[PDB]
Enzyme design. Sequence first.
Site, PDB file in Angstrom:
ATOM      1  CE  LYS A  85      -6.247  15.501  30.886  1.00  0.00           C
ATOM      2  NZ  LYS A  85      -6.557  16.857  30.267  1.00  0.00           N
ATOM      3  CG  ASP A  86      -5.507  11.946  34.655  1.00  0.00           C
ATOM      4  OD1 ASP A  86      -5.147  13.057  34.985  1.00  0.00           O
ATOM      5  OD2 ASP A  86      -6.610  11.712  34.097  1.00  0.00           O
ATOM      6  NE  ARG A 133      -2.505  20.520  28.225  1.00  0.00           N
ATOM      7  CZ  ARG A 133      -3.735  20.546  27.687  1.00  0.00           C
ATOM      8  NH1 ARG A 133      -3.970  21.077  26.457  1.00  0.00           N
ATOM      9  NH2 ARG A 133      -4.726  19.981  28.364  1.00  0.00           N
ATOM     10  NE  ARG A 134      -7.106  22.021  28.824  1.00  0.00           N
ATOM     11  CZ  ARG A 134      -7.776  20.970  29.288  1.00  0.00           C
ATOM     12  NH1 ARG A 134      -8.042  20.804  30.580  1.00  0.00           N
ATOM     13  NH2 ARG A 134      -8.077  19.974  28.440  1.00  0.00           N
ATOM     14  NE  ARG A 152      -8.111  20.064  40.518  1.00  0.00           N
ATOM     15  CZ  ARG A 152      -7.712  19.288  41.492  1.00  0.00           C
ATOM     16  NH1 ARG A 152      -7.177  19.859  42.588  1.00  0.00           N
ATOM     17  NH2 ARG A 152      -7.824  17.954  41.400  1.00  0.00           N
ATOM     18  NE  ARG A 158     -11.877  20.328  36.033  1.00  0.00           N
ATOM     19  CZ  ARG A 158     -10.740  20.984  35.808  1.00  0.00           C
ATOM     20  NH1 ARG A 158     -10.688  21.911  34.846  1.00  0.00           N
ATOM     21  NH2 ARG A 158      -9.651  20.668  36.513  1.00  0.00           N
ATOM     22  CB  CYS A 245      -1.383  16.555  35.679  1.00  0.00           C
ATOM     23  SG  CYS A 245      -1.834  15.018  34.825  1.00  0.00           S
TER      24      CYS A 245
HETATM   25  C1  LIG Z   1      -3.023  15.617  33.384  1.00  0.00           C
HETATM   26  C2  LIG Z   1      -4.109  16.484  33.914  1.00  0.00           C
HETATM   27  N1  LIG Z   1      -5.144  16.098  34.655  1.00  0.00           N
HETATM   28  C3  LIG Z   1      -5.936  17.112  35.059  1.00  0.00           C
HETATM   29  C4  LIG Z   1      -7.091  17.002  35.875  1.00  0.00           C
HETATM   30  C5  LIG Z   1      -7.950  15.901  36.061  1.00  0.00           C
HETATM   31  N2  LIG Z   1      -7.638  14.542  35.842  1.00  0.00           N
HETATM   32  C6  LIG Z   1      -8.699  13.757  36.118  1.00  0.00           C
HETATM   33  O1  LIG Z   1      -8.764  12.444  36.065  1.00  0.00           O
HETATM   34  C7  LIG Z   1      -9.688  14.595  36.503  1.00  0.00           C
HETATM   35  C8  LIG Z   1     -11.124  14.140  36.848  1.00  0.00           C
HETATM   36  C9  LIG Z   1     -11.992  14.143  35.532  1.00  0.00           C
HETATM   37  C10 LIG Z   1     -13.313  13.438  35.686  1.00  0.00           C
HETATM   38  O2  LIG Z   1     -14.359  14.036  35.354  1.00  0.00           O
HETATM   39  O3  LIG Z   1     -13.238  12.199  36.019  1.00  0.00           O
HETATM   40  C11 LIG Z   1      -9.249  15.915  36.468  1.00  0.00           C
HETATM   41  C12 LIG Z   1     -10.039  17.194  36.894  1.00  0.00           C
HETATM   42  C13 LIG Z   1      -9.719  17.668  38.353  1.00  0.00           C
HETATM   43  O4  LIG Z   1      -9.714  18.917  38.598  1.00  0.00           O
HETATM   44  O5  LIG Z   1      -9.399  16.803  39.201  1.00  0.00           O
HETATM   45  C14 LIG Z   1      -5.392  18.192  34.509  1.00  0.00           C
HETATM   46  C15 LIG Z   1      -5.943  19.695  34.686  1.00  0.00           C
HETATM   47  C16 LIG Z   1      -6.936  20.030  33.617  1.00  0.00           C
HETATM   48  C17 LIG Z   1      -7.388  21.504  33.790  1.00  0.00           C
HETATM   49  O6  LIG Z   1      -7.662  21.937  34.937  1.00  0.00           O
HETATM   50  O7  LIG Z   1      -7.595  22.133  32.725  1.00  0.00           O
HETATM   51  C18 LIG Z   1      -4.242  17.831  33.801  1.00  0.00           C
HETATM   52  C19 LIG Z   1      -3.297  18.784  33.038  1.00  0.00           C
HETATM   53  C20 LIG Z   1      -3.623  19.040  31.535  1.00  0.00           C
HETATM   54  O8  LIG Z   1      -2.897  19.861  30.946  1.00  0.00           O
HETATM   55  O9  LIG Z   1      -4.519  18.412  30.967  1.00  0.00           O
END
Ligand SMILES: *Cc1[nH]c(/C=C2\NC(=O)C(CCC(=O)O)=C2CC(=O)O)c(CCC(=O)O)c1CC(=O)O
Length: 302
Positions: A85-86, A133-134, A152, A158, A245
Amino acid sequence: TAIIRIGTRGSPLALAQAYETREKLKKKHPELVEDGAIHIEIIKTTGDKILSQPLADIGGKGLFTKEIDEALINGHIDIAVHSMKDVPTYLPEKTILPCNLPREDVRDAFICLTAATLAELPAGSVVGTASLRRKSQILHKYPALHVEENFRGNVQTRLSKLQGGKVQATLLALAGLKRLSMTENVASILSLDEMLPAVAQGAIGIACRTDDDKMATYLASLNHEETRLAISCERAFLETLDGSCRTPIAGYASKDEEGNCIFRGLVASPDGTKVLETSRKGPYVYEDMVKMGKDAGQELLS
Ligand SMILES: *Cc1[nH]c(/C=C2\NC(=O)C(CCC(=O)O)=C2CC(=O)O)c(CCC(=O)O)c1CC(=O)O
């Protein structure tokens, strides 16, 4: 000297994903069982640094992937393990991403110390999530809640913020809690009718260099084509919509009991007041699925 250098982020979840990849490789290729055969290279990315503001307020491409893509392209590592997803919709020049591990559960978990569900939260309760999205889907169904977008950090950060009372509730992918063995933090699981997942949620992707036949052959022993196909469909949808994202877009493809692809996608206003959903069904075949995600996306556009 290692046979395989695996690049990954250095959070507990990213290492969980890298160790799942190691375990699967060792089972198919026992030469990788020796300690020495696999080296894990922890790589800091810019997304690991810029944690003090919402994700939708952070510019640029590849926040969680760019330094790892540069290590792969230039020969510091041999494969790169990402949360799918990333991964940006455009893959880095000189790399391919030919492998997805079997997908985990795609649903979101509701995390809360005082209520079992979103609907049990008092009006005005604060839900932490940096995902539009959420946020959009929560506020569509629960307009009386407040979403804190400056929420974050890694999974355990979190969970720590929630325990410290920084918010009343948060959401996390059930996949990540499962991979970390931290599912006792789940208050409830949101159904796909309450919360459609991010594109490629619950999937681990593994990239290698385009010209690296040895690595491509190892990765062919890990790839789960049913998952890779679903993720290619959702990513075609996302790419059409120029999503990331930081956009309020969700999409989920899966194979039904007759062997067809069922895709559901949505786009929403960030305040949750408007949501457009699309759904498509068609053969579970790469070119049809990519065209389906693209068509779905064009119909959310026009
Ligand atoms: C696509 C998407 N990604 C995020 C946030 C993160 N991606 C990550 O790789 C990580 C680190 C996770 C870990 O424990 O390794 C994060 C978390 C961060 O704040 O960096 C998000 C946001 C998710 C949210 O805040 O609910 C998205 C968007 C989505 O809709 O999933």
